[PDB]
Structures are given as C-alpha cells and as structure tokens.
Write a protein that binds this ligand. Structure first.
Ligand SMILES: [Ca+2]
Ligand SMILES: [Ca+2]
Ligand SMILES: [Ca+2]
Lengths: 188, 330, 179
C-alpha cells in the first residue's frame, strides 16, 4: 500500500491519496515521500492508531469506544418489534452520525453556547464544533469564541438533510414553528 | 605511508570493528564533508555483497591520503561483522549501526554535505513479488530527497542499485514513465541516479570479442585490480603489503577519471561561446587530458539533474555550467 | 467485585464477540454493532473502522476532529518530529506553548450526586442539556444507562437521545469538558 501510493504520486503529485495502514511505524514512510502533502487532505487512516485510541478513551470514560464507532458507520433507524426497551434506544444511537454543514446568517454575531442551544432546542441537532477562519477546529469553546460569517459547523444528527435545517434557519420566519420538518423552506 | 604489496591501494594494519564503530554522538562530532555514504540494507542472515569492491577503488593509490573521500557505511552490525574481515584494511572507513531510513542516522552523517550517497540492498532479491523488491531502495532515496536542512534537499547526489529495471520509474518524481521503455533510456539512469544490473549482460559478449576491453575497464574502474592481487587473495590471508620499494610506488601514476567544470580555470573561455572540439584539442596538448564526454544540465531556461553525453561531435556548443569527463595524469 | 471489573477486549473476528458475555441471545447473522457486548463497551472489533475510509473523503475535517478528541492533540507537528527518528522530545517549554492544555477532553458525569442530580429523579434529557451548557460549558453527547432496571452492572450507550427522553438517577452522561 505504501508502494501503491508512490506509484500514484510518481504519475501525478497534486492528488488526494487516502491510505489504510495497519501498523503505526509504517506511517512514517508515507510522511517522508516528497509529493505526499498533509495540506491537501492526504490522510493515512492508520488502524492501530485509532483502534487503540478508541479503546484508550474508554479507559477515561467507559463505553466511549462504541459511542464514536457508531457515529461513522452510516446507519438508519429500523426498529423491529422483536427488540426490547434497551435495544430500541441503542439502535436510535446507531443512526446518529457526524456531519459538516454551514450555519445560516441567523447564527452570525452570536456566542457558541447560545448557538448550540438553538441547534438542540429548536432544530434538534447536537452542535459539537465550529471551524474558525489556517482554519482552526475548535471543539466546544466557551462564550468568548463568536460565530463569524459562513462558519463550518460539526453536527451529530440522523441524516445530512436533517442538518440542512441549520442552513435554512431564519430568526424572522421560523421562530414560532414547533414542527421541525416545516423548516424545509429555503425562503426566509 | 602504508600500501598494498602491488602498490595499488592504501593499506592498513588489521583492526577490530570497535575501532571504526560510531554512534550518533561520535559521527556528528566528526566534521564530515565531501564524502561517501553507503546506505546499506541487510538482515543478519542475508548474503554478502562485498562492499570491499565499492570501497577498494575509492582507496586507489592515485589519490593522496588527504584527498581520499571518507566512507560511512550505515546498516546492521550482524551483517557488517562478516564483511569487516575484507573491509578492515581500508583507511577512513566508519561504520554506524541502524537502518538508513532513520533521519537521525543521516543527519549525524551530514548527508547534505555528501559527494555521493550510495544506496545498496543486500536482501534476498525475488522471493515474493516484483513490486516489493526495491521497497527499501526507493523509500531511502525518496526520504533523502524529501529532507530539508538548516546550516540542499533534492540537491543531495545519490545512486541507487536496483533488482528490477521497471522500478526505476519510482525514483524521480518529474518525468514521463513507460515500462515499455528500456532501462537505459529512462531519466534516472541517464542522469547517473540509477544503476541496474541488467546493463552488464552485454559484457559477456565483449569479453569474447575484445579480450583486452574487459581488462581495460578493470584498470580504469577498480583502480588497478591486477591478477597479482587475485592470486594473493585466493591464498586466503586477506590484503597485505607494508611500506614497499620506490620501484613499486612509482605505480601511482595511472589514469583515473575526473570531472572538470567549465566555470573557473583556463578552460572556462571555451564554455562561454566555443565548441567541444576546440576544448578537446587545447586540453590535450597542454595538460595531457582526453575529454570523454559531458555532464550537462537537463533544464536550461530549476532542478540540479545533469545527464551524460559520451563523445559528442566536433561542432557541439558548450555552456558555462557544463562538466567534462576526463582521464588525468595527476 | 468479580464480574464488576470493567474490561474491553480487542477482537480479530466479529463472530467471536458472542463468547464474551454469558447472558444474551446470540446469532452470527446479527452484525457486530447490534450485539450486547459491543453496545455496552465490553468489545471493540476492528471491522467498525471500515467506514472511516469513506468519511475521510467526504468530510476532510471529520477525521482530524476525532484525532484531536481521541489521541489528545496528535498534531501534524508531532508526526514530522517522530518521522525524523529521535522519538518524543521537549523539556519545560514556554507559557505560550503550555497555554495549549485547555482543549476539550471527554468525561462521564453520574447523575447521583452534585447539582445535576435533580434532573435524574424526574426530568428529561433536554432539560439537562440546556442547564449544563449555560452554567458549566458542557455538551451532553449521550447516556450510559443500566441494561437491567427492575442485577448485573452492564451499561449501554445512547448517543444523542431525543429532547423528551426520561432520565434515571443511576445514569451516566458523556460530556465534553473545559476542566
Ligand atoms: Ca442515520
Ligand atoms: Ca518517475
Ligand atoms: Ca454470549
């Protein structure tokens, strides 16, 4: 797989090459290829780094290994009647996933905790992080970090179209609507 | 000084490995510059290459002791303990353990201030695939090109031995590559960056036709590997000699190969405007020099990759940046 | 204190997850994620990270999000230092560098003691999330609820439940902290 990368990068340098490595010491060889550029999204998905990392965070907070593992497998909620009370609540948790989408102009000049509250209370979307314009990736910052225009927000939600309610939100129009499916309106 | 019985090589008394052994502390302390770096890949169980044959011609009696380029081999101790039997009788030789993929090893060696970094692989050739053969040889060359120094990254001159000819394409990063195209036509070979074994298949034919043409180059390459040596080495006691008589030491005069840049010196006038034919005649009369060929820059309009031109025409224009291969009497 | 020892087992095979726990319904037809040992954080197969190749294409930043959240700030700065071959290095460092201790780690908050215990008795998850966010600077991601409630000590994950979801005093809540 290291040689597969070299052959691609030999043919053409400017290209995104994502690799699945197994051992962590082999990741050092990919980083020393001259064409391999971190900046343009060449991600060496090292399994041993992540595998043990997921486990390591469970030592700090048990069960976190399977909180995160479910966020990246793209699932959908199909509650069969054979399941019990505890399983149906778990299988809803499997259907949640990470998503990136831009916040609307309603969130501009507004603090993080108040913004994350509006996403949860009204829109029903858990807002984790906001990328701030070197684009720094700030996870759950305090009240000091404000929201600039066209900020990329990181959401835990059921689907991507559910997160698109953040993009179509309006303080003038949608502020009195209880049904959250009624926020499909791009017209604000 | 000490010399071989033949009067062809710089000899030494026999040593243990720990005299010439170094760590990263001791190697960096030694102010190494304008030298050779043998990046050697080998297991303990892997068979002998005979790095003796690499180091021997570097230690030719043509060169003075101060002029010798100090060689630093980088590999296993278990492997080099075998080859130390042959290598021990060569001055300015230094062994540093560990693999040469580690940048901590190369930065201690001062690979940025290297005349030629030779990459060799002693490991078993074709035991698995054709693509995974030169994994170490390619990754080492790419590692050195990628490095940057602060007192020179891609400007480190190196030469890579290869098992497969098709794997030559992965070395250099900026050229048109086809496995249909033979090894000799490729950009890495043409610039002296690669050297496959396959180019010496033709040497079996020349040894039949021109009996003397094979023994010509053994004088010109190995630096006077006389049959006298081969029978001494067959007797099994390694290299030997001492101080030797002035009749034997008068055999230091033979023609070595050398490059002459046309930037400074008296030959620089020809590089500006004149031709190769005008250079050859002037150099031959005054200095005793046969210009074989040129080592011209690929890009002229900027990477520092020069390519070979063996015996060009009489009317061939020169540049001030060119370098000329020459047989000297110095 | 025998079965109450919390442990997590790496596995080569997904089908071998069934042999870990002793009290559940087992079918090799059922996938690794649905099984009781995985759901409770007792197992972790490698197969669940096959999907991570797709997310790295679509969401370039979603992969580098979790590497901050998991490894605890494995910056590219480190990866190039480690590629240079001399291992980890540092020293005491300046106060500008040591101001980078503030990032959000993950943590559990039990709803038995403390100010949040009031919500565990009667109230819902939505009421907890809003109160915790304003005062403390906390995002409640999910719950780690007991399987049996009517007794083994096996808790299962619930990632981002609904607004109206009832809590118990025995629950534990996953949280991103600033402490
Ligand atoms: Ca879903
Ligand atoms: Ca190439
Ligand atoms: Ca079982």
């Amino acid at each position: 797989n290291i040689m597969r990368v070299i052959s691609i990068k030999n043919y053409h340098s400017d290209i995104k090459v994502i690799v699945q490595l197994l051992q962590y010491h082999n990741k050092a060889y990919l980083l020393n290829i001259p064409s391999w550029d971190w900046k343009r999204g060449d991600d060496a998905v090292c399994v041993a780094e992540l595998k043990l990392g997921f486990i390591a965070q469970s030592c700090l907070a048990p069960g976190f290994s399977t909180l995160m593992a479910n966020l990246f497998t793209m699932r959908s909620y199909k509650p069969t009647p054979e399941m019990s009370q505890w399983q149906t609540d778990y299988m809803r948790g499997t259907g949640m996933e990470m998503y990136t989408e831009y916040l609307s102009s309603a969130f501009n000049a507004l603090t993080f905790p108040e913004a994350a509250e509006l996403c949860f209370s009204k829109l029903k979307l858990l807002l984790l992080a906001i990328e701030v314009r070197e684009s720094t990736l700030a996870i759950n910052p305090g009240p000091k970090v404000k929201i600039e225009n066209a900020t990329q927000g990181f959401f835990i939600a059921e689907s991507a179209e559910e997160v698109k309610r953040a993009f179509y939100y309006c303080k003038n129009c949608h502020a009195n609507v209880s049904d959250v499916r009624q926020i499909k309106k791009c017209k604000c | 000084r000490k010399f071989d019985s033949t009067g062809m090589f710089h000899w030494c008394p026999d040593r243990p490995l720990n005299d010439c052994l170094q760590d990263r502390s001791q190697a960096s302390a030694s102010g190494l510059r304008n030298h050779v770096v043998v990046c050697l890949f080998a297991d303990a169980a892997s068979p002998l290459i005979g790095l003796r044959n690499l180091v021997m011609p570097l230690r030719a009696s043509n060169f003075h002791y101060h002029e010798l380029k100090p060689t630093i081999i980088v590999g296993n101790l278990d492997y080099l303990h075998r080859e130390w039997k042959t290598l021990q009788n060569f001055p300015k030789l230094s062994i540093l353990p560990g693999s040469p993929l580690n940048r901590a090893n190369l930065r201690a060696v001062n690979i940025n201030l290297c005349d030629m970094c030779v990459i060799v692989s002693a490991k078993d050739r074709n035991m698995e695939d054709p693509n995974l053969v030169d994994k170490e040889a390619i990754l080492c060359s790419l590692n050195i090109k990628a490095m940057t120094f602060d007192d020179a990254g891609a400007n480190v001159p190196l030469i890579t031995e290869l098992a497969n000819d098709s794997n030559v394409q992965f070395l250099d990063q900026d050229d048109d590559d086809d496995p249909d195209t033979e090894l000799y036509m490729t950009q890495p070979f043409a610039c002296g960056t690669a050297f496959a074994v396959s180019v010496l298949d033709s040497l079996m034919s020349t040894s039949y036709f021109n009996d003397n043409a094979l023994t010509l180059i053994r004088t010109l390459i190995t630096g006077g590997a006389t049959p006298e040596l081969e029978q001494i080495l067959a007797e099994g006691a390694g290299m030997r000699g001492g101080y030797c008589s002035p009749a034997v030491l008068a055999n230091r005069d033979r023609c070595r190969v050398a490059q002459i840049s046309l930037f400074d010196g008296p030959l620089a006038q020809f590089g500006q405007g004149g031709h190769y034919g005008e250079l050859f005649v002037y150099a031959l009369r005054h200095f005793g020099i046969l210009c074989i060929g040129l080592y011209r820059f690929r890009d002229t309009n900027p990477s520092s990759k020069r390519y070979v031109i063996t015996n060009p025409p009489e009317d061939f224009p020169l540049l001030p940046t060119d370098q000329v291969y020459v047989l000297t009497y110095k």
